[PDB]
Design a protein around this ligand. Structure first.
Ligand SMILES: [Mn+2]
Ligand SMILES: [Mn+2]
Lengths: 197, 197
């Protein structure tokens, strides 16, 4: 069974950029609900599959992408954030960023653009393209996970569901986007990128 | 007002790779129908737009994308083929193919896989990514046009609707894919590649 990962930090470790009320609801309520519902759906899929009930397997897909993706996306998200974070990466990651996007600041414009560009709920991603051997930016609707739906390996995700910012920033998503750059755990992103090498 | 372009060759020019019956049906019936229905939809949209009828506008979008995309895609497709075609391209395009995909043979596998990979009706495309400055393979469902939905600039299209091949190859879509390379007009895709730069 899948379980709720602990936050690597306190609910209020990201203040003042993401306030503690958000962090607490986002983790203990939204993420918790995805894990529990995933578990339920996986159990129901076990039965459908054993019976060769194809109709039921197909009927269960939305719940499985949504709750499974919910779990995958937030689990990556918490490791992407840190009180020790902000700034710019170093080493190869930074050179790949300059190489594929021109400059770190050009990269930030792009990921922000994708993230701001999401109509409705969704996520902006920095991913790695294993076929082409380079970095790539992508956006996903609702809880659709990056690797499951595109093949890109996720490096850094930014959650632009309204629940991820609305208590602090209301309708002004680009203020949230501005703020989050200050808490990005470039340590972890670099780690994920070295895993693709 | 849009019109059906003449074919650059005669209906039997691509034998024995694509037979004369397919070409004549594809051009004089299928493309003609997209053109006809595009003209009709565009006029209706003009009316809705001048009445500020957003409902009617939004209700016309599937027809506009389907018939518009059909017109766009087939227009490109006819120039991508030639009775004098086949072989490999030369100059920069060939260099970009080697740089972006490794070799011409690997590129060919990648375009084939993406084309075979289409479930239902659609197109495989070789495209150009402006903001990244490189070649990029994509696939579009139905008549969704490459640029309008994806931003990539079309260089080479491979129609994998069943009408593109079924009378001659039936269900064996890969044999059609193996055959079409004998008639690719590399001169035209080169031009399209030089126009991007
Ligand atoms: Mn969320
Ligand atoms: Mn067609």
């Amino acid at each position: 069974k899948h379980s709720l990962p602990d936050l690597p930090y306190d609910y209020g470790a990201l203040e003042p950029h993401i306030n503690a009320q958000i962090m607490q609801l986002h983790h203990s309520k939204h993420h918790a609900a995805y894990v529990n519902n995933l578990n339920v759906t996986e159990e129901k899929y076990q039965e459908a599959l054993a019976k060769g009930d194809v109709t039921a397997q197909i009927a269960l897909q939305p719940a499985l992408k949504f709750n499974g993706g919910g779990h995958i996306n937030h689990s990556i998200f918490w490791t992407n954030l840190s009180p020790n974070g902000g700034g710019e990466p170093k080493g190869e990651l930074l050179e790949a960023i300059k190489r594929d996007f021109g400059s770190f600041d050009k990269f930030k414009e792009k990921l922000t653009a994708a993230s701001v560009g999401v109509q409705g709920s969704g996520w902006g991603w920095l991913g790695f393209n294993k076929e082409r051997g380079h970095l790539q930016i992508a956006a996903c609707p609702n809880q659709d996970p990056l690797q499951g739906t595109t093949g890109l390996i996720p490096l850094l995700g930014i959650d632009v569901w309204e629940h991820a910012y609305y208590l602090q920033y209301k309708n002004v998503r680009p203020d949230y986007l501005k703020a989050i750059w200050n808490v990005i755990n470039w340590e972890n992103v670099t780690e994920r990128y070295m895993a693709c090498k």
